[PDB]
Amino acid sequence: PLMVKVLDAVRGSPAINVAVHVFRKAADDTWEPFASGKTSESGELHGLTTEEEFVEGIYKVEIDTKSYWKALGISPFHEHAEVVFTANDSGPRRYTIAALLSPYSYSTTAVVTN
Amino acid sequence: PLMVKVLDAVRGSPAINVAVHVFRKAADDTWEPFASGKTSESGELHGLTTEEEFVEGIYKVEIDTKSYWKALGISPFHEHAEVVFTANDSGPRRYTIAALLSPYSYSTTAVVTN
Amino acid sequence: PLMVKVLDAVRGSPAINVAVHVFRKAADDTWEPFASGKTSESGELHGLTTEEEFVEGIYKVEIDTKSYWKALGISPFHEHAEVVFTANDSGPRRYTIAALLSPYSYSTTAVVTNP
Amino acid sequence: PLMVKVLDAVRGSPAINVAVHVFRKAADDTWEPFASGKTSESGELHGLTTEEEFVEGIYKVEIDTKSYWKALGISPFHEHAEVVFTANDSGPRRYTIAALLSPYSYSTTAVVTNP
Ligand SMILES: Oc1c(Br)cc(Oc2ccccc2)cc1Br
Ligand SMILES: Oc1c(Br)cc(Oc2ccccc2)cc1Br
Numbered sequence: 187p188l189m190v191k192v193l194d195a196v197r198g199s200p201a202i203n204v205a206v207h208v209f210r211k212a213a214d215d216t217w218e219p220f221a222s223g224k225t226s227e228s229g230e231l232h233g234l235t236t237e238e239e240f241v242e243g244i245y246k247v248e249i250d251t252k253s254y255w256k257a258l259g260i261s262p263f264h265e266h267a268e269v270v271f272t273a274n275d276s277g278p279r280r281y282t283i284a285a286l287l288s289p290y291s292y293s294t295t296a297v298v299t300n
Numbered sequence: 301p302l303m304v305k306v307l308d309a310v311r312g313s314p315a316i317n318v319a320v321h322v323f324r325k326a327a328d329d330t331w332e333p334f335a336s337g338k339t340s341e342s343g344e345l346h347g348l349t350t351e352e353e354f355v356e357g358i359y360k361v362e363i364d365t366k367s368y369w370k371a372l373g374i375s376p377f378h379e380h381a382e383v384v385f386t387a388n389d390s391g392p393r394r395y396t397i398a399a400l401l402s403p404y405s406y407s408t409t410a411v412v413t414n
Numbered sequence: 415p416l417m418v419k420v421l422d423a424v425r426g427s428p429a430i431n432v433a434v435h436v437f438r439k440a441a442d443d444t445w446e447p448f449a450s451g452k453t454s455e456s457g458e459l460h461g462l463t464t465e466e467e468f469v470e471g472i473y474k475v476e477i478d479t480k481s482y483w484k485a486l487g488i489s490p491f492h493e494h495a496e497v498v499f500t501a502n503d504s505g506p507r508r509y510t511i512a513a514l515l516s517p518y519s520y521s522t523t524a525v526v527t528n529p
Numbered sequence: 530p531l532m533v534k535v536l537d538a539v540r541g542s543p544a545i546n547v548a549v550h551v552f553r554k555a556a557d558d559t560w561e562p563f564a565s566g567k568t569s570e571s572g573e574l575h576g577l578t579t580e581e582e583f584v585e586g587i588y589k590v591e592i593d594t595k596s597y598w599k600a601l602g603i604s605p606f607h608e609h610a611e612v613v614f615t616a617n618d619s620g621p622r623r624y625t626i627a628a629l630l631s632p633y634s635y636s637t638t639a640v641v642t643n644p
Binding site for chain 2: 491494522
């Protein structure tokens, strides 16, 4: 039900081998590790979770943008990019979290479909 | 070699049934019609052209954002969104032109891969 | 009543010395040149027009993004960024057209206020 | 030396009365509260800090986008928009953190200048 896609606005390409960590907010308000991976050659990260595991809750998707830029020899502004949202059962079932990266900027959108 | 994808930042969804017109710049500097279609349920428009037809040149992709918003009962700022670029044979072969739409704003990126 | 602001997303700075050409759609559907200038050290372009001159119409603000990236010796994707909109059709408004630039991407937004 | 500016992409206006909380990473890796305020009628938040107070560190600027969309009675996707960055590590700089907001999307950029 959850896919993360990362794009590079400098080279006009997927952002490949970018580390992505997903956390679920626990009852004590701390962020607990949920799922993680690295984006593929298409800039996409599939198979993070299952419908069964992805219960309603607040999730954080952290994208390691700083390591991405450093590997390209480019000095970036952000330590990482966060995307924090509520999964809701009465909305559509599938969530794509997309991020478009520049050294000093990023944009993020959610594409939520049934 | 060319795909157009349109997303709606208000509803967090593909932008469906959006008209898209592609033009190639002619030798006299006018824009000649090249290809067109409407985005599908996925917000994507495939099959606009073929490798054979898509020679190097300056192309314009016009996205009918105004009709999109009006159909949703929302008053938009832009008459349309243009994306104007050079197709180059010595870059990667496949071009995705993506646009993310808001009533008073849009962003566009190119994802160019081999 | 019309201001254009351009930012550089690679450098995290104003985009300085960016050429901007404004056109207005004429009675015969052609784009007539309306005003032009370059962004300053703040990435802003002021003084393009006056409240008297800036009548109702369809305007195109062409931002010469290719010349900017290339004048910096970078090879960008877009020829330019065009922002096309109806203005002043419920009476005079003030418009800021903002653009944030990357070699293969740009974002634009409008801030519209009523004086 | 720190300014936060927030714009509304749905209305084409400044995003007014947006709550912003700034944190600084402490020696024990926790986020310590640093400064907070709300955007004005121009969508700008000035006066958060001083050049003396704003030392080297890792800062998080949390923009309370959910409260903004909901205080307007809209149901948005994000809880907030967080912008996390190292500041002043080559000496004092001025930072503008800009955010452009839509119910299911936001963009952020930094403008960093050397006084
Ligand atoms: O498949 C996609 C998606 Br979804 C978004 C996209 O563009 C953006 C991603 C993040 C923020 C803004 C635009 C490009 C492609 Br190709
Ligand atoms: O003064 C500004 C700034 Br700074 C950014 C701006 O546009 C953007 C803000 C955040 C993310 C992308 C673009 C518009 C205006 Br008027």
